[PDB]
């Protein structure tokens, strides 16, 4: 049960400071970790090693605004004076008798322009598709910044996870982002519920659109 | 310092063998721990194994040991990964890397990495799309406008092109990037925002062309009565 736990996402604006946390399982509480950065389309970069008492090894080529500290089971990466190029996945790692343990990574968004909230357009299955014995709900998400969203689907009021396919956000020509999410149902499932909902979460706030088969 | 670069096929059929090459420069003459690591969608990174090119000996992740081979070609500054009998679980970005030899405070780390290569395990073959109309809705549009569209479902490979009214309609068109589904097939949506007053008189047709399958569809998108 050697586990490194990281929150999946974080966001901050240019010039701010952020502290990312790696939490060590109790059996690993005295272990050394390494921090890495992965910028989009770039090779991961080793940033530093950090031991249980807070000593670290600075790495050649890594800006001084990256530093590390420790407290009990927690290992921190602090990034001061955030630059646009600091937007990246940050992941921690340790080593236990020839086994590498990785954290899940924290995706840090660094805003270099103001937050923009998503437009959400939800389409029900077409009658033509239902005649082909299929049903797809289409949730189109546009004009948001930063490019990080989560999507949750509901049947009536109950969460639905099966049959969901969601894109990674992609940058539009206007520098905001777009994404789409598709929910696959049988025609019988579609016609038997009162409604289905697509809920988009972006920087803490939510937008939920709903469609009903009786429409 | 050390530079690494992965290469190899981006698609592998289920039950076949995945092969990747790493090209290196700036390494030691001898004594490098040339390593492979992968990250699957939604999961954390996973070490695959390494070879030390002084000893020639390999170490593999036990969960993959039966399927993995790592080897070197010092004469061309390359090393290699093979992974046999692949399944969907092996779809991942694959990285080559170099482990350190400092063992500072009891950890080994990956001091240098390549940019990674995506390998998708896929049984998909050339297939034309099904095209469905997305009838106009004004629930989420600005005043006086409606969004209508076409759902272009279950095609392979990319790309598809979508035009509207044979290219006469370009303003207000947003063709979204496709989703690669777990089936191995792509789906995308193209939506156009038009004046609501036009819905009674103006005809809207999406023109879908899937050149790989030589399939074309011209789908009328009508208001719901």
Numbering used by the authors:
A (entry chain L): 1 to 9, 11 to 27, 27A, 28 to 52, 52A, 52B, 52C, 52D, ...
B (entry chain H): 1 to 52, 52A, 53 to 82, 82A, 82B, 82C, 83 to 100, 100A, ...
Which statements did the authors publish about this structure?
We found that Ab1303 neutralized 12 of the 19 cross-clade strain panel with IC50 values < 100 μg/mL, whereas Ab1573 neutralized five strains in the panel with IC50 values < 100 μg/mL19. To further explore the interactions of Ab1303 and Ab1573 with Env trimer, we solved 1.51 Å and 2.50 Å crystal structures of unbound Ab1303 and Ab1573 Fabs and single-particle cryo-EM structures of BG505 SOSIP.664 complexed with Ab1303 and Ab1573 to resolutions of 4.0 Å and 4.1 Å, respectively. For both antibodies, there were no major structural changes between their free (solved by X-ray crystallography) and bound (solved by cryo-EM) forms: Root mean square deviations, rmsds, for superimposition of free and bound Ab1303 VH and VL (235 Cα atoms) were 0.72 Å, and 0.89 Å for superimposition of free and bound Ab1573 VH and VL (231 Cα atoms), with minimal differences in the complementarity determining region (CDR) loops. Similar to the results for b12, Ab1303 and Ab1573 did not bind BG505 that was captured by PGT145, suggesting that the closed Env trimer occludes epitopes for Ab1303 and Ab1573.
Ab1303/Ab1573 binding is observed only when Env trimers are not constrained in the closed, prefusion conformation. Fab-Env cryo-EM structures show that both antibodies recognize the CD4bs on Env trimer with an ‘occluded-open’ conformation between closed, as targeted by bNAbs, and fully-open, as recognized by CD4.
